[PDB]
């Protein structure tokens, strides 16, 4: 219900680099915060969320807001934020040093667990005061691991009764209207047996106990699932159930990791070794960053556990995968994908060629391992003899700099799409129909700063924020054939259901509303789009009375596409609790530049990976150089 | 070593050579710096 | 073929009675209700198409006249509802599907009779009725289909969808009559009348088979032959099925075995079936059968051959047991006795398969065998001993080291046919269970022997070469596995290599090898050896160049090898 805690921050120099460090506290539910070191929208932060609630001036939606305090300054080595949150009526609200520093929260939702998040920018150390945030990249003894991602009849009755009294007495001996109460308890047991209608029976009994235990817990609360309660309790419950049983007898999701395209190998024989810091089943240019893994024309792999490799298809050829077990895969010149297990060699016969390929490693939730990579030290297991016999040399000397691999990531973006899904004035509206699932969503490509819609064809519509993109999901309105268009100089609505809903919500300070909606299901799409104010907005030129059509149109979905590559270091200090204060040292600088889309974090490496963006950037650079020409001031 | 600073050995060098030329033209270089550049060339003498 | 397919997994419309059956008054009572209910439904359904009451037949305009309320009716308009109903109930009366009276009791609109019928869905088939809707849908379609059939029987055409077996038809077509049939019986129970008479496929097949099989056994004891062919088909089906009652099925299997066992007390089919049964194997009656075989075996030892062959096959079951007790101890004891008393090689193999304080006697026998080392005079006892050693190793999981030493001694003795092959299998098992230096010394001793044989080498030489090829290959394979496990070996490899070169270059030898293969029914080893030898890159390149042209001594040796590798490549 109520919870409160205190964390005191240690000695952070506010400036190294031209940055005012990061070190904002707030709180957050699991869902919808999924930090990345790539950095979010608007050039990435905390309190960005409609998740994050963090705390200075304001944080919320990634839109700082001023706040009354008495220190009226940023946290520094001196202080102790003094955190508080109620859940019940849910308000986080805050103090520092017991000093009121104003009221905030309420009006969002229950769901998930709203823990405390601490952000450190630079060199800083802090105590937390009580008595990872996900992560593809791990943490390893030799070569970083890499793991994730984890979501976490009457006669019978008489027999029962008489048997029950005996049981109560037997139980009584061990301890050293009452039974009676014992008989009533036996009767309950009978009800449980009726509900139930070999070890599985024992498990069922334990489950029933938890369920009854659960009702008991509810009663106590009025005054956690049994797996949740814990193993010792479960074991104790199991024993009683077992005694009862003797008496009865008597009575009679997946993350894919990729390599840079530049590394690409188009010829020869090479070897890649995968290291497992995780035990489980995993599969080892064209393949999509995001999509089904291991069952496609794009690549060939088999689950370690299964002793099966997707052709894509079904096959055996191997011992079941063992945690912390060496694996070895081996040629451009021939055409095989030999698999050496522990080397300890197990391959594929006759394979197409060109466009290189490399092998892609995708890890499903909860196992980490590290896959390598460079140096002789690297041959491990090994996994060395084969290289010696194989002559399929490791990347070795080439790629002296450490290799970099793009990451699938977590959050979809409302990207452009063309001819996809097959089967994907005005007119504007279109869509593709096949055996299309819902969906919807839609989105648009015009930005408003700080006037018509047609459709018809039931479906939620609203207008989406620049940061509106978020995981979808069922998306039933609202979670945080008449078409009415609302124009904002104001209140945005339109004429709901053809005829007025009235006016629902509006912000007039200077945000910036993006229009689409999401439409889902049906044999025929029947969607029609379009513009006065909208036309004026879209073009710097105008507004003009005549309707205008953009060179560009927008779409198509956030998608669930993974493509951002990871980085160089991300070392800090962790951050040990017991003592209660964690200190982080060093500095990180991001060369990435924000788009006018806008606010996405570019990641320079990402730009390098994407040529079209790169081409545009290069052209821009040339133009800039050109303006400079002639030595003009 | 399978390089590539730029995937173009030449691109990387051009970037460096141009900077060097600009510096030499500028003449904002130490005599010791000049000696270092000469050594850098091949150390013929 | 059909059976294999199942494993992978033209008319006569019955004549009911529909006027020979004249409704009891309780059915007349349901007829007022059900018929009235039907009229109401018509208003409800005809009103759904916007139809209405009028006073005349404006059927296109969405109007009846008969959409006069159920109360308004002339009974003759009610007969449009009563007739289908009367046919329904009468059909039931015809089947003696008695309809016991407990109770008779029952959108863009317009005009009409707009009743709301006590909806049909709202009651659903009791288990009596769950059987009934199937036959009413079956029967109703037939009467309709029989009228359709009289219509078809008038017209001289091709095939009738409802005039072709009803079940072939989509469940959706089957639905149309059901839409009459469920509509009757559920509605009857809804009106307070029951209508009362008066994977899984694999399990069913197995049961039917057990049911027949017993019949067949009875027949054997006393068209029967044709069914027996069916038995072979069934056995094939069973093998496919497994992989795809289990214990119960096995018990049935025991009965089949008893029948076959009795016969032992079409031969190939039974054997295949037995083998399949054996394949299947991979109760008290079974224990008894085993005991009989043991006793039977003892009798055979004292003095049928078919029974004996069957018993050997029973050996396969033991292997199956291996994959996954008094009678067993006893029969087992008889087996041990037979072994002591000791086609003989085959019997020994069967005994070993079956085998697959007490530890002490075995240890003493083992010590005796070790004593046995350096001399033999008995091919059969040694094989039995090897099987026993394998069983002991299995029981164990030191002792393993002793077993390995024993194996080495055995190899030495061998160095000093079918028995040889059995020995080889035992050796492979021993190697798997698996000192190394001693093995290497032994190999050096052998390899040298092989080299000598090569130097010596017409047909006899080829046969000797073939013998050298089998043992050398096997023991060699185990040795290679050991070397990999612990990866001088280069020297051993070089020797193997010389032999390999002679082998690549052997015509009479090649023919001998082919003959040996044929009788049964070295490249991999050579490759492993080559890898070991490869185990100085520039020097290697120079050597390769020299080979193409074809420590200094070592280099020359490497070059010679390279030539061997080239020969191998040429293949």
PDB file of C-alpha atoms in Angstrom, chain A residues 371-379 394-403:
ATOM      1  CA  UNK A 371      29.546 -16.048 -28.677  1.00  0.00           C
ATOM      2  CA  UNK A 372      33.030 -15.261 -30.098  1.00  0.00           C
ATOM      3  CA  UNK A 373      35.018 -13.947 -31.956  1.00  0.00           C
ATOM      4  CA  UNK A 374      38.661 -12.792 -31.865  1.00  0.00           C
ATOM      5  CA  UNK A 375      42.069 -14.263 -30.964  1.00  0.00           C
ATOM      6  CA  UNK A 376      43.892 -17.583 -30.420  1.00  0.00           C
ATOM      7  CA  UNK A 377      42.938 -17.340 -26.799  1.00  0.00           C
ATOM      8  CA  UNK A 378      39.436 -17.350 -28.224  1.00  0.00           C
ATOM      9  CA  UNK A 379      39.779 -20.733 -29.753  1.00  0.00           C
ATOM     10  CA  UNK A 394      38.717 -17.516 -37.509  1.00  0.00           C
ATOM     11  CA  UNK A 395      38.251 -13.869 -38.452  1.00  0.00           C
ATOM     12  CA  UNK A 396      41.529 -13.455 -36.636  1.00  0.00           C
ATOM     13  CA  UNK A 397      43.808 -10.563 -37.636  1.00  0.00           C
ATOM     14  CA  UNK A 398      41.221  -8.990 -39.868  1.00  0.00           C
ATOM     15  CA  UNK A 399      38.757  -6.890 -37.914  1.00  0.00           C
ATOM     16  CA  UNK A 400      41.413  -6.000 -35.353  1.00  0.00           C
ATOM     17  CA  UNK A 401      38.934  -3.548 -33.865  1.00  0.00           C
ATOM     18  CA  UNK A 402      36.308  -5.477 -31.905  1.00  0.00           C
ATOM     19  CA  UNK A 403      33.314  -6.500 -34.016  1.00  0.00           C
TER      20      UNK A 403
END
